Amino acid sequence: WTNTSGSCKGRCFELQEVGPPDCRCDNLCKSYSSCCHDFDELCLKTARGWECTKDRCGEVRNEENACHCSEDCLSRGDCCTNYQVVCKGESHWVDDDCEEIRVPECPAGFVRPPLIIFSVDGFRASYMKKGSKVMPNIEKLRSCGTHAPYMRPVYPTKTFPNLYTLATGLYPESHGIVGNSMYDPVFDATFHLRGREKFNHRWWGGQPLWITATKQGVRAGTFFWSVSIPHERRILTILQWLSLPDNERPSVYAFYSEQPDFSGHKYGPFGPEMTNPLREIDKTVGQLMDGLKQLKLHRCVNVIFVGDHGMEDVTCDRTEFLSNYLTNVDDITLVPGTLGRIRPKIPNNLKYDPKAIIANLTCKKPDQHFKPYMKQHLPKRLHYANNRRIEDLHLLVERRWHVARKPLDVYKKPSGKCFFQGDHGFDNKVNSMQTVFVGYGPTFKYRTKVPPFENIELYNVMCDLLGLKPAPNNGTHGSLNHLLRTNTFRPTLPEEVSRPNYPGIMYLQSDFDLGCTCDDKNKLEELNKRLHTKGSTEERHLLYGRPAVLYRTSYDILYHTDFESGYSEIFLMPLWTSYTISKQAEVSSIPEHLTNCVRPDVRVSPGFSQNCLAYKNDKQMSYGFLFPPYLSSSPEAKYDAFLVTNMVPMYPAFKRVWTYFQRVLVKKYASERNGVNVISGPIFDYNYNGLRDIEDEIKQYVEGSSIPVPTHYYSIITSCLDFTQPADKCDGPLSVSSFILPHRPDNDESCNSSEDESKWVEELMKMHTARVRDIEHLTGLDFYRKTSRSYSEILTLKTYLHTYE
Numbered sequence: 001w002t003n004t005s006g007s008c009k010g011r012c013f014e015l016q017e018v019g020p021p022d023c024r025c026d027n028l029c030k031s032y033s034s035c036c037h038d039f040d041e042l043c044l045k046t047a048r049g050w051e052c053t054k055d056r057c058g059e060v061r062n063e064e065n066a067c068h069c070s071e072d073c074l075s076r077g078d079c080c081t082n083y084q085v086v087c088k089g090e091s092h093w094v095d096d097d098c099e100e101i102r103v104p105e106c107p108a109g110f111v112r113p114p115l116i117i118f119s120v121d122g123f124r125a126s127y128m129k130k131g132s133k134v135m136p137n138i139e140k141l142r143s144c145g146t147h148a149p150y151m152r153p154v155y156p157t158k159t160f161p162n163l164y165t166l167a168t169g170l171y172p173e174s175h176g177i178v179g180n181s182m183y184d185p186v187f188d189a190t191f192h193l194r195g196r197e198k199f200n201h202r203w204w205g206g207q208p209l210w211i212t213a214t215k216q217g218v219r220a221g222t223f224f225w226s227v228s229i230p231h232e233r234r235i236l237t238i239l240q241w242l243s244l245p246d247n248e249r250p251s252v253y254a255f256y257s258e259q260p261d262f263s264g265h266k267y268g269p270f271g272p273e274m275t276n277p278l279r280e281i282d283k284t285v286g287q288l289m290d291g292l293k294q295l296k297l298h299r300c301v302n303v304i305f306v307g308d309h310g311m312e313d314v315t316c317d318r319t320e321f322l323s324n325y326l327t328n329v330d331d332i333t334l335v336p337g338t339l340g341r342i343r344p345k346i347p348n349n350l351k352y353d354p355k356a357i358i359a360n361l362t363c364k365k366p367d368q369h370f371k372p373y374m375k376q377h378l379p380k381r382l383h384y385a386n387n388r389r390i391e392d393l394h395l396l397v398e399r400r401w402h403v404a405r406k407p408l409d410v411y412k413k414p415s416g417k418c419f420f421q422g423d424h425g426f427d428n429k430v431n432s433m434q435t436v437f438v439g440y441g442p443t444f445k446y447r448t449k450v451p452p453f454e455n456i457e458l459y460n461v462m463c464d465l466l467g468l469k470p471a472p473n474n475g476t477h478g479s480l481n482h483l484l485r486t487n488t489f490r491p492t493l494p495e496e497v498s499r500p501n502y503p504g505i506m507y508l509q510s511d512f513d514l515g516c517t518c519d520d521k522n523k524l525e526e527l528n529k530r531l532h533t534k535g536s537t538e539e540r541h542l543l544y545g546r547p548a549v550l551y552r553t554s555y556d557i558l559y560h561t562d563f564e565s566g567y568s569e570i571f572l573m574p575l576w577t578s579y580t581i582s583k584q585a586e587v588s589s590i591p592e593h594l595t596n597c598v599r600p601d602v603r604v605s606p607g608f609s610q611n612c613l614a615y616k617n618d619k620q621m622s623y624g625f626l627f628p629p630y631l632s633s634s635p636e637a638k639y640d641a642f643l644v645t646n647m648v649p650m651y652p653a654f655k656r657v658w659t660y661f662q663r664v665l666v667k668k669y670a671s672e673r674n675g676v677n678v679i680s681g682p683i684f685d686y687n688y689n690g691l692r693d694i695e696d697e698i699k700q701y702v703e704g705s706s707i708p709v710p711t712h713y714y715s716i717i718t719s720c721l722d723f724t725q726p727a728d729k730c731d732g733p734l735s736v737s738s739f740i741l742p743h744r745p746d747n748d749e750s751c752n753s754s755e756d757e758s759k760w761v762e763e764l765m766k767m768h769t770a771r772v773r774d775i776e777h778l779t780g781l782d783f784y785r786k787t788s789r790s791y792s793e794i795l796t797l798k799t800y801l802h803t804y805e
């Protein structure tokens with residue numbers, strides 16, 4: 001029970017926690033119907049709108065007015081944002097020339113520059129191209145401050161997942177807001193954007209910025225705003241909070257608009273009708289900046305302008321129906337649209353067979369506009385599996401399309417058309433899904449463009465801007481130091497945990513009974529007294545230092561003419577294998593006498609080696625090599641590529657992809673990039689958590705052996721950003737692309753796999769692009785430790801994703 005009979009007079013949008021028995025007058029009281037009786041009539045004052053006019057100047061100080069143009073208002077804190085322009089001859093902020101802000105210029109009493117986040121919903125990156133012509137305030141912020149060409153959202157590219165990611169630095173699988181809708185089988189309950197369930201704290205994991213702030217004694221304004229509070233009132237309320245006394249004023253503030261998402265749904269992202277809503281958002285930015293100017297705060301506050309996701313052309317004419325593939329759509333529930341999630345209509349139904357469902361959904365039409373995945377097979381870059389609220393069966397939908405359960409779910413109007421022309425939610429590397437980031441203020445750089453970056457990285461930066469220590473999150477702290485003039489974070493290299501051994505020859509060829517045969521021999525090699533010493537191997541093949549191993553284990557560094565490896569005695573295969581291929585390198589075949597050749601490695605004991613007998617007994621599993629024999633520098637050097645310590649388990653289906661990569665693509669990359677350095681190796685993630693497995697977690701081994709089966713294989717391909725220098729003699733910034741390829745028994749993912757590999761393997765690889773950082777989590781390795789670049793530059797490099805968009 002609250003006593004509603006109280007008043008909000010001289011209390012509207014107050015901040016304090018007010019508790020029941022007292023009625024409320026804050027941001028969210030409406031949501032709870034717990035407002036004082038006069039809130040609506042008093043705090044939503046709408047009369048005369050939100051701008052002064054020439055005739056209102058001087059103004060008899062009336063209290064029905066939405067905002068004031070009285071002689072005193074700069075005193076009574078209540079001015080319309082344009083009061084000074086219209087009534088005292090000052091200029092709008094946007095008409096003043098950009099001036100660098102080298103240090104905060106703050107009134108007395110301000111101890112740190114405030115942070116104001118201006119978040120916009122569905123603001124696609126390319127809307128910035130509609131520039132000063134339509135959005136001059138925003139264009140001033142963008143060109144005078146620090147901007148990226150775009151910011152990558154998280155998957156699903158919907159609003160709830162993405163705002164909560166912005167707030168927490170976490171992937172949706174970690175913070176728990178994995179869609180705008182979800183079902184939690186432990187709560188036996190469903191979360192929706194509409195209604196009351198969302199207000200329950202049980203859904204919301206992680207630690208969002210306003211809590212991180214509060215726990216560290218830094219006051220936060222409310223980030224949530226009832227839908228009935230108009231945009232202009234949100235701005236005026238921010239401005240009023242900034243005028244509070246020193247012991248009450250917050251340091252962090254957020255504004256949110258539902259636009260231009262709503263117009264984008266209705267008209268599409270390129271509809272001519274999109275102009276007016278963009279103009280309105282710009283107007284609102286200008287109200288803020290004018291209000292900051294009236295307060296003498298426009299050279300004191302750090303302003304972030306950010307979006308949650310983009311928008312794509314999508315109409316009802318472009319819908320696939322599961323009823324065209326499945327015999328009983330009535331027994332399943334589908335979360336539909338720009339993604340699919342399927343579960344039995346009755347939870348834990350024994351009749352539910354996801355294998356038969358996946359089979360009926362797989363490559364049934366030549367232009368099929370979605371693709372089914374078990375969630376553990378989704379591209380790793382999506383980080384969309386490790387949560388009980390994510391259904392096992394997922395549909396990745398093609399851009400511009402929807403998936404629905406059956407035709408009755410689409411409502412084509414008399415028109416022949418639907419009401420909507422725009423949607424989002426698609427794969428986050430899709431271009432139309434990208435959004436915006438601009439930072440302006442004393443802490444941000446002046447007239448600086450920065451590379452595109454992922455929204456998971458912002459939380460650390462907002463923390464930096466506020467003097468806070470971030471809660472553990474998925475950002476890479478220091479990757480965005482290059483956005484800031486100061487308050488940078490000094491990151492420190494993680495400590496290597498296991499140090500390598502450097503074994504020489506400990507064994508005779510006669511010590512080994514691995515069941516392996518090699519029907520040829522390089523007799524010249526046994527006369528090489530320096531065989532397999534470091535020599536120039538490291539200089540040539542390990543260009544940025546050995547990866548540090550950050551977990552406890554036993555491994556060996558192995559040197560060869562063409563490659564270097566870090567060989568695990570625990571997993572019986574390399575953790576990594578590193579080599580450099582010149583622009584002019586020649587590709588060669590595997591001679592007939594060597595096709596089935598595997599050689600024991602006299603540096604590593606029989607007992608730490610694979611055996612060929614296991615592979616001969618595994619009816620499903622074959623093997624491949626991490627350094628490819630195809631790229632051997634000489635016939636002589638080719639024999640090292642057949643070492644048992646270079647061998648890894650591979651399904652025949654995977655070998656189709658891997659041979660094509662090794663024999664064709666690596667050289668292609670070396671031609672185009674003027675040499676490449678490649679690091680390749682295995683990944684084990686049987687529990688799909690994005691993190692390196694411990695041994696207990698590994699669930700498949702080559703029959704009758706302790707040889708573990710990787711869930712994926714990675715490769716990291718580095719060269720000089722300036723391609724006029726060769727990979728091995730690079731003086732400047734680096735260029736990287738990486739992959740985490742799924743290690744599967746079939747190519748059912750690739751609809752065109754019955755064809756030659758030049759028709760499908762590359763399309764597969766582009767889908768499974770990855771960040772170096774993603775591989776680091778999955779392997780417990782740390783790359784690029786010895787370079788001529790700064791550590792902050794390297795962290796940026798490690799968070800880059802090559803998108804092929």
Ligand SMILES: *[C@@H]1O[C@H](CO)[C@@H](O[C@@H]2O[C@H](CO)[C@@H](O[C@@H]3O[C@H](CO[C@H]4O[C@H](CO)[C@@H](O)[C@H](O[C@H]5O[C@H](CO)[C@@H](O)[C@H](O)[C@@H]5O[C@H]5O[C@H](CO)[C@@H](O)[C@H](O)[C@@H]5O)[C@@H]4O)[C@@H](O)[C@H](O)[C@@H]3O)[C@H](O)[C@H]2NC(C)=O)[C@H](O)[C@H]1NC(C)=O
Pocket residue numbers: 170171173174175176202203204205206383386387388472473474689690691777
């Ligand atoms: C992205 O960044 C995050 C944050 O660092 C990493 O996630 C962390 O991973 C570690 C290692 O697995 C986990 O540590 C374990 O913590 C538990 C105790 O966990 C409880 O307490 C912590 C701290 O107060 C809390 O954060 C946890 O939150 C989880 O559980 C909540 C339900 O209680 C839920 O609301 C919340 O959304 C979150 O669930 C997620 O994590 C759990 C596993 O904890 C997972 O099952 C689930 O599906 C979600 O993904 C929890 O109450 C100890 O007992 C263990 O020994 C171990 O220390 C952290 O808990 C986990 N933290 C969070 C917030 O997720 C990711 O690994 C990183 N991803 C990548 C790919 O780098």
Ligand SMILES: C[C@H](NC(=O)CCc1nc2cccnc2n1Cc1ccc(OC(F)(F)F)cc1)c1ccc(Cl)cc1
Pocket residue numbers: 031117119159160161163164166167198199209223224225226227254255256306
């Ligand atoms: C209807 C009302 N909507 C709002 O408050 C709009 C702001 C908002 N919607 C969010 C949805 C999921 C997570 N957070 C949401 N927020 C707060 C918010 C979170 C992040 C944010 O961006 C950033 F972090 F400042 F960069 C800006 C605002 C609402 C009320 C209760 C709940 Cl549980 C969710 C939304």
Ligand SMILES: *[C@@H]1O[C@H](CO)[C@@H](O)[C@H](O)[C@H]1NC(C)=O
Pocket residue numbers: 325326327328356357360
């Ligand atoms: C798969 O499709 C076939 C018809 O092609 C059908 O007999 C079977 O019922 C379908 N199974 C499911 C689970 O939809």
Ligand SMILES: [Ca+2]
Pocket residue numbers: 684685686687688689690691692693697
């Ligand atoms: Ca794992």
Ligand SMILES: [K+]
Pocket residue numbers: 615616617618619620621622
């Ligand atoms: K076999």
Ligand code: NA
Pocket residue numbers: 747748749750751752753754
């Ligand atoms: Na196929």
Ligand SMILES: [Zn+2]
Pocket residue numbers: 122261262265424
């Ligand atoms: Zn939307």
